Amino acid sequence: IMIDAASSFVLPISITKNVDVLQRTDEILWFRGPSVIVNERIINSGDPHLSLPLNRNEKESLPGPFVLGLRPSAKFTAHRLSMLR
Amino acid sequence: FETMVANPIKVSRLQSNGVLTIHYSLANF
Amino acid sequence: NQLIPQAYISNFHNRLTNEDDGIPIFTMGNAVLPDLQDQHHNPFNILRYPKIRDTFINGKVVSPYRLSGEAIMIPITLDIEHM
């Protein structure tokens, strides 16, 4: 199992006309596999949607993925911006 | 377009780790 | 490292034959020397002065030469043409 493969490639034709949105070298970088989209980085480790307790067929349409991601409440953020100045 | 072999970018491990960025240490004329 | 040795430059004869310095021994900011101006502890800054890269470029390496009740003073003149 090797480590030092290249795994990125560049085509010789300068097509740099409509490409300011992609990832440029500074040309266009062309990798050997796709990307990986990760929804939320921090798992919410309790929350019986995920913990599955052993007590007591049901569906639930939760709002967004933001339930599973430890977001702070806004009153603390306003308190901290008041503590800013 | 299907005959357009691409250029590998080699990393060369010792370049990736710790390369710094000689007359500017004045002891050698 | 990065330290200048304490000796081994004796650029004196080229200033004797510089023809700008008014030395009568031979015939054939806005300051000039940084003896009042700091250089923020880089020796390379002293290479901006035009009489000092003259003593690093045109210098050489020298080897050191090694060695009554009332004084009577006598003046001695010296006048020799040579080449």
PDB file of C-alpha atoms in Angstrom:
ATOM      1  CA  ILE A   1       0.000   0.000   0.000  1.00  0.00           C
ATOM      2  CA  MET A   2       1.692   3.162  -1.228  1.00  0.00           C
ATOM      3  CA  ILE A   3       1.307   6.722   0.031  1.00  0.00           C
ATOM      4  CA  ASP A   4       3.210   8.938  -2.421  1.00  0.00           C
ATOM      5  CA  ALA A   5       0.882   8.728  -5.437  1.00  0.00           C
ATOM      6  CA  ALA A   6       0.138  12.027  -7.169  1.00  0.00           C
ATOM      7  CA  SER A   7      -3.710  11.984  -7.066  1.00  0.00           C
ATOM      8  CA  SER A   8      -4.078  15.415  -8.679  1.00  0.00           C
ATOM      9  CA  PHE A   9      -3.783  16.294 -12.333  1.00  0.00           C
ATOM     10  CA  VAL A  10      -3.772  19.373 -14.566  1.00  0.00           C
ATOM     11  CA  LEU A  11      -4.826  19.493 -18.245  1.00  0.00           C
ATOM     12  CA  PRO A  12      -2.575  21.601 -20.524  1.00  0.00           C
ATOM     13  CA  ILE A  13      -5.290  23.702 -22.217  1.00  0.00           C
ATOM     14  CA  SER A  14      -5.828  27.027 -20.463  1.00  0.00           C
ATOM     15  CA  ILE A  15      -9.621  27.074 -20.145  1.00  0.00           C
ATOM     16  CA  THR A  16      -9.420  29.811 -17.475  1.00  0.00           C
ATOM     17  CA  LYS A  17     -12.267  31.963 -18.782  1.00  0.00           C
ATOM     18  CA  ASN A  18     -15.391  30.947 -16.828  1.00  0.00           C
ATOM     19  CA  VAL A  19     -13.501  29.317 -13.962  1.00  0.00           C
ATOM     20  CA  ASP A  20     -13.178  31.592 -10.953  1.00  0.00           C
ATOM     21  CA  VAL A  21     -15.513  29.518  -8.757  1.00  0.00           C
ATOM     22  CA  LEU A  22     -13.565  26.214  -8.703  1.00  0.00           C
ATOM     23  CA  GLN A  23     -10.297  25.431  -6.884  1.00  0.00           C
ATOM     24  CA  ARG A  24      -7.381  26.852  -8.865  1.00  0.00           C
ATOM     25  CA  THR A  25      -3.667  26.061  -8.337  1.00  0.00           C
ATOM     26  CA  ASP A  26      -2.088  29.522  -8.655  1.00  0.00           C
ATOM     27  CA  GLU A  27      -5.000  26.340 -13.951  1.00  0.00           C
ATOM     28  CA  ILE A  28      -7.644  23.921 -12.646  1.00  0.00           C
ATOM     29  CA  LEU A  29      -6.896  21.060 -10.259  1.00  0.00           C
ATOM     30  CA  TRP A  30      -8.397  17.720 -11.325  1.00  0.00           C
ATOM     31  CA  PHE A  31      -8.362  15.042  -8.628  1.00  0.00           C
ATOM     32  CA  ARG A  32      -8.547  11.249  -8.877  1.00  0.00           C
ATOM     33  CA  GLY A  33     -11.785  10.927  -6.900  1.00  0.00           C
ATOM     34  CA  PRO A  34     -14.823  13.057  -6.038  1.00  0.00           C
ATOM     35  CA  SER A  35     -15.376  15.254  -3.016  1.00  0.00           C
ATOM     36  CA  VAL A  36     -17.152  14.328   0.230  1.00  0.00           C
ATOM     37  CA  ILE A  37     -20.015  16.513   1.467  1.00  0.00           C
ATOM     38  CA  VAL A  38     -20.451  16.386   5.244  1.00  0.00           C
ATOM     39  CA  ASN A  39     -23.663  17.935   6.586  1.00  0.00           C
ATOM     40  CA  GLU A  40     -22.669  18.778  10.163  1.00  0.00           C
ATOM     41  CA  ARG A  41     -19.333  18.153  11.810  1.00  0.00           C
ATOM     42  CA  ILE A  42     -20.374  17.759  15.470  1.00  0.00           C
ATOM     43  CA  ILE A  43     -22.521  14.769  16.431  1.00  0.00           C
ATOM     44  CA  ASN A  44     -25.204  15.281  19.091  1.00  0.00           C
ATOM     45  CA  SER A  45     -24.539  12.237  21.244  1.00  0.00           C
ATOM     46  CA  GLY A  46     -27.654  12.070  23.430  1.00  0.00           C
ATOM     47  CA  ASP A  47     -31.083  12.870  21.893  1.00  0.00           C
ATOM     48  CA  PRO A  48     -33.258   9.669  21.723  1.00  0.00           C
ATOM     49  CA  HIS A  49     -33.568  10.147  17.975  1.00  0.00           C
ATOM     50  CA  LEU A  50     -29.979   8.844  18.105  1.00  0.00           C
ATOM     51  CA  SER A  51     -29.384   7.282  21.541  1.00  0.00           C
ATOM     52  CA  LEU A  52     -32.381   4.854  21.299  1.00  0.00           C
ATOM     53  CA  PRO A  53     -33.313   4.056  24.939  1.00  0.00           C
ATOM     54  CA  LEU A  54     -34.723   0.604  25.728  1.00  0.00           C
ATOM     55  CA  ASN A  55     -38.079   1.825  27.082  1.00  0.00           C
ATOM     56  CA  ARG A  56     -41.485   2.413  25.471  1.00  0.00           C
ATOM     57  CA  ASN A  57     -43.640   2.347  13.846  1.00  0.00           C
ATOM     58  CA  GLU A  58     -43.608   6.132  14.247  1.00  0.00           C
ATOM     59  CA  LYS A  59     -42.295   8.876  11.973  1.00  0.00           C
ATOM     60  CA  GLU A  60     -41.199  12.444  12.712  1.00  0.00           C
ATOM     61  CA  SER A  61     -40.285  15.172  10.213  1.00  0.00           C
ATOM     62  CA  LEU A  62     -37.801  17.209  12.203  1.00  0.00           C
ATOM     63  CA  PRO A  63     -36.956  20.753  11.046  1.00  0.00           C
ATOM     64  CA  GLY A  64     -33.661  20.610   9.159  1.00  0.00           C
ATOM     65  CA  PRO A  65     -30.432  18.894  10.165  1.00  0.00           C
ATOM     66  CA  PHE A  66     -29.765  21.677  12.698  1.00  0.00           C
ATOM     67  CA  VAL A  67     -31.352  19.692  15.544  1.00  0.00           C
ATOM     68  CA  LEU A  68     -28.387  17.281  15.415  1.00  0.00           C
ATOM     69  CA  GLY A  69     -25.594  19.837  15.531  1.00  0.00           C
ATOM     70  CA  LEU A  70     -25.253  21.734  18.856  1.00  0.00           C
ATOM     71  CA  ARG A  71     -26.218  25.178  17.894  1.00  0.00           C
ATOM     72  CA  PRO A  72     -26.048  27.926  20.541  1.00  0.00           C
ATOM     73  CA  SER A  73     -29.114  29.932  21.418  1.00  0.00           C
ATOM     74  CA  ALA A  74     -29.345  33.565  20.377  1.00  0.00           C
ATOM     75  CA  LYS A  75     -29.730  35.075  23.851  1.00  0.00           C
ATOM     76  CA  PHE A  76     -26.188  33.982  24.738  1.00  0.00           C
ATOM     77  CA  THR A  77     -24.858  35.428  21.493  1.00  0.00           C
ATOM     78  CA  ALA A  78     -26.544  38.758  22.208  1.00  0.00           C
ATOM     79  CA  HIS A  79     -25.201  38.612  25.778  1.00  0.00           C
ATOM     80  CA  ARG A  80     -21.689  38.035  24.439  1.00  0.00           C
ATOM     81  CA  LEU A  81     -22.019  40.819  21.863  1.00  0.00           C
ATOM     82  CA  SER A  82     -23.132  43.069  24.723  1.00  0.00           C
ATOM     83  CA  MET A  83     -20.015  41.954  26.610  1.00  0.00           C
ATOM     84  CA  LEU A  84     -18.002  42.844  23.482  1.00  0.00           C
ATOM     85  CA  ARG A  85     -18.475  46.592  24.049  1.00  0.00           C
TER      86      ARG A  85
ATOM     87  CA  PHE B   1     -10.116  15.218 -26.070  1.00  0.00           C
ATOM     88  CA  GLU B   2      -9.857  11.561 -25.058  1.00  0.00           C
ATOM     89  CA  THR B   3      -6.137  11.494 -26.050  1.00  0.00           C
ATOM     90  CA  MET B   4      -5.007  14.148 -23.571  1.00  0.00           C
ATOM     91  CA  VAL B   5      -2.824  12.450 -20.889  1.00  0.00           C
ATOM     92  CA  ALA B   6      -2.761  14.631 -17.783  1.00  0.00           C
ATOM     93  CA  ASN B   7       0.202  15.941 -15.811  1.00  0.00           C
ATOM     94  CA  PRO B   8       0.801  14.498 -12.330  1.00  0.00           C
ATOM     95  CA  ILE B   9       1.693  16.972  -9.605  1.00  0.00           C
ATOM     96  CA  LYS B  10       4.324  15.277  -7.450  1.00  0.00           C
ATOM     97  CA  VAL B  11       4.627  16.366  -3.830  1.00  0.00           C
ATOM     98  CA  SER B  12       8.189  15.128  -2.989  1.00  0.00           C
ATOM     99  CA  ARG B  13       7.680  14.574   0.780  1.00  0.00           C
ATOM    100  CA  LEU B  14      10.723  16.523   2.006  1.00  0.00           C
ATOM    101  CA  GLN B  15       9.363  19.607   0.233  1.00  0.00           C
ATOM    102  CA  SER B  16       5.978  19.222   1.939  1.00  0.00           C
ATOM    103  CA  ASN B  17       7.312  19.197   5.516  1.00  0.00           C
ATOM    104  CA  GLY B  18       9.656  21.994   6.457  1.00  0.00           C
ATOM    105  CA  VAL B  19      11.172  24.080   3.650  1.00  0.00           C
ATOM    106  CA  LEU B  20      12.383  27.490   4.844  1.00  0.00           C
ATOM    107  CA  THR B  21      11.815  30.776   3.028  1.00  0.00           C
ATOM    108  CA  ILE B  22      23.966  32.365   1.266  1.00  0.00           C
ATOM    109  CA  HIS B  23      25.248  35.944   1.139  1.00  0.00           C
ATOM    110  CA  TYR B  24      22.648  37.521   3.457  1.00  0.00           C
ATOM    111  CA  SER B  25      24.521  36.125   6.464  1.00  0.00           C
ATOM    112  CA  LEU B  26      27.527  38.420   6.075  1.00  0.00           C
ATOM    113  CA  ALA B  27      30.505  36.165   6.648  1.00  0.00           C
ATOM    114  CA  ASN B  28      31.337  35.041   3.082  1.00  0.00           C
ATOM    115  CA  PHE B  29      32.935  37.328   0.523  1.00  0.00           C
TER     116      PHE B  29
ATOM    117  CA  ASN C   1      27.771  31.044  12.669  1.00  0.00           C
ATOM    118  CA  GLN C   2      26.879  34.359  10.925  1.00  0.00           C
ATOM    119  CA  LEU C   3      29.706  36.279  12.638  1.00  0.00           C
ATOM    120  CA  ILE C   4      32.425  38.291  10.911  1.00  0.00           C
ATOM    121  CA  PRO C   5      35.989  37.313  11.889  1.00  0.00           C
ATOM    122  CA  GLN C   6      37.816  39.946  13.895  1.00  0.00           C
ATOM    123  CA  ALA C   7      40.677  40.628  11.489  1.00  0.00           C
ATOM    124  CA  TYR C   8      42.128  39.692   8.078  1.00  0.00           C
ATOM    125  CA  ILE C   9      41.281  42.871   6.122  1.00  0.00           C
ATOM    126  CA  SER C  10      43.960  45.499   5.497  1.00  0.00           C
ATOM    127  CA  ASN C  11      42.559  47.633   2.677  1.00  0.00           C
ATOM    128  CA  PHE C  12      44.950  50.540   3.116  1.00  0.00           C
ATOM    129  CA  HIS C  13      47.074  50.667  -0.049  1.00  0.00           C
ATOM    130  CA  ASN C  14      44.042  51.034  -2.317  1.00  0.00           C
ATOM    131  CA  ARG C  15      43.008  54.127  -0.363  1.00  0.00           C
ATOM    132  CA  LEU C  16      46.591  55.319  -0.753  1.00  0.00           C
ATOM    133  CA  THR C  17      46.098  54.974  -4.526  1.00  0.00           C
ATOM    134  CA  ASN C  18      42.404  55.901  -4.645  1.00  0.00           C
ATOM    135  CA  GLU C  19      42.960  59.379  -6.249  1.00  0.00           C
ATOM    136  CA  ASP C  20      39.823  60.674  -4.459  1.00  0.00           C
ATOM    137  CA  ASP C  21      41.202  60.536  -0.923  1.00  0.00           C
ATOM    138  CA  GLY C  22      43.679  63.364  -0.470  1.00  0.00           C
ATOM    139  CA  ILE C  23      46.554  61.272   0.896  1.00  0.00           C
ATOM    140  CA  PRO C  24      49.978  62.790   0.052  1.00  0.00           C
ATOM    141  CA  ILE C  25      51.871  59.499   0.511  1.00  0.00           C
ATOM    142  CA  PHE C  26      51.508  58.143  -3.039  1.00  0.00           C
ATOM    143  CA  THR C  27      50.964  59.770  -6.411  1.00  0.00           C
ATOM    144  CA  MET C  28      50.634  56.821  -8.812  1.00  0.00           C
ATOM    145  CA  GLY C  29      20.850  59.763   4.944  1.00  0.00           C
ATOM    146  CA  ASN C  30      23.621  61.914   3.479  1.00  0.00           C
ATOM    147  CA  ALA C  31      26.434  60.574   5.671  1.00  0.00           C
ATOM    148  CA  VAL C  32      29.318  58.584   4.236  1.00  0.00           C
ATOM    149  CA  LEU C  33      30.116  56.333   7.229  1.00  0.00           C
ATOM    150  CA  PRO C  34      27.605  54.868   9.757  1.00  0.00           C
ATOM    151  CA  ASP C  35      29.393  56.017  12.890  1.00  0.00           C
ATOM    152  CA  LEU C  36      26.322  57.920  14.106  1.00  0.00           C
ATOM    153  CA  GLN C  37      23.502  55.900  12.489  1.00  0.00           C
ATOM    154  CA  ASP C  38      22.202  52.554  13.692  1.00  0.00           C
ATOM    155  CA  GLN C  39      21.502  49.783  11.193  1.00  0.00           C
ATOM    156  CA  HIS C  40      18.981  47.726  13.247  1.00  0.00           C
ATOM    157  CA  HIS C  41      21.492  44.906  13.812  1.00  0.00           C
ATOM    158  CA  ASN C  42      21.906  43.628  10.272  1.00  0.00           C
ATOM    159  CA  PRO C  43      25.534  43.877   9.086  1.00  0.00           C
ATOM    160  CA  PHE C  44      24.274  43.745   5.475  1.00  0.00           C
ATOM    161  CA  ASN C  45      23.013  47.329   5.886  1.00  0.00           C
ATOM    162  CA  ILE C  46      26.628  48.531   6.047  1.00  0.00           C
ATOM    163  CA  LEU C  47      26.973  47.415   2.426  1.00  0.00           C
ATOM    164  CA  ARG C  48      24.810  50.367   1.361  1.00  0.00           C
ATOM    165  CA  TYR C  49      27.613  52.816   2.142  1.00  0.00           C
ATOM    166  CA  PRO C  50      29.823  53.376  -0.904  1.00  0.00           C
ATOM    167  CA  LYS C  51      33.172  53.465   0.905  1.00  0.00           C
ATOM    168  CA  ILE C  52      32.512  50.218   2.790  1.00  0.00           C
ATOM    169  CA  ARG C  53      31.740  47.730   0.055  1.00  0.00           C
ATOM    170  CA  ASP C  54      34.960  49.241  -1.320  1.00  0.00           C
ATOM    171  CA  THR C  55      36.799  47.690   1.630  1.00  0.00           C
ATOM    172  CA  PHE C  56      35.107  44.296   1.300  1.00  0.00           C
ATOM    173  CA  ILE C  57      35.445  43.999  -2.486  1.00  0.00           C
ATOM    174  CA  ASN C  58      38.943  45.463  -2.886  1.00  0.00           C
ATOM    175  CA  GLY C  59      40.296  44.133   0.413  1.00  0.00           C
ATOM    176  CA  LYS C  60      42.963  41.509   1.020  1.00  0.00           C
ATOM    177  CA  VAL C  61      44.137  39.282   3.886  1.00  0.00           C
ATOM    178  CA  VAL C  62      47.149  40.354   5.951  1.00  0.00           C
ATOM    179  CA  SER C  63      49.421  38.535   8.419  1.00  0.00           C
ATOM    180  CA  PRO C  64      50.395  40.418  11.593  1.00  0.00           C
ATOM    181  CA  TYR C  65      53.928  41.712  11.911  1.00  0.00           C
ATOM    182  CA  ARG C  66      55.560  40.658  15.160  1.00  0.00           C
ATOM    183  CA  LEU C  67      58.250  42.200  17.320  1.00  0.00           C
ATOM    184  CA  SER C  68      68.108  57.395  28.453  1.00  0.00           C
ATOM    185  CA  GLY C  69      67.354  60.480  30.524  1.00  0.00           C
ATOM    186  CA  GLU C  70      66.291  63.153  28.038  1.00  0.00           C
ATOM    187  CA  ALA C  71      64.683  62.786  24.622  1.00  0.00           C
ATOM    188  CA  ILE C  72      66.089  64.715  21.653  1.00  0.00           C
ATOM    189  CA  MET C  73      63.578  65.234  18.842  1.00  0.00           C
ATOM    190  CA  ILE C  74      64.816  65.405  15.241  1.00  0.00           C
ATOM    191  CA  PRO C  75      62.494  65.863  12.229  1.00  0.00           C
ATOM    192  CA  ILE C  76      63.139  63.542   9.288  1.00  0.00           C
ATOM    193  CA  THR C  77      61.915  64.176   5.751  1.00  0.00           C
ATOM    194  CA  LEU C  78      61.446  61.395   3.216  1.00  0.00           C
ATOM    195  CA  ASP C  79      61.328  62.001  -0.546  1.00  0.00           C
ATOM    196  CA  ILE C  80      61.888  58.972  -2.805  1.00  0.00           C
ATOM    197  CA  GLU C  81      60.662  58.406  -6.338  1.00  0.00           C
ATOM    198  CA  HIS C  82      60.126  54.736  -7.155  1.00  0.00           C
ATOM    199  CA  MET C  83      58.455  53.365 -10.327  1.00  0.00           C
TER     200      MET C  83
END
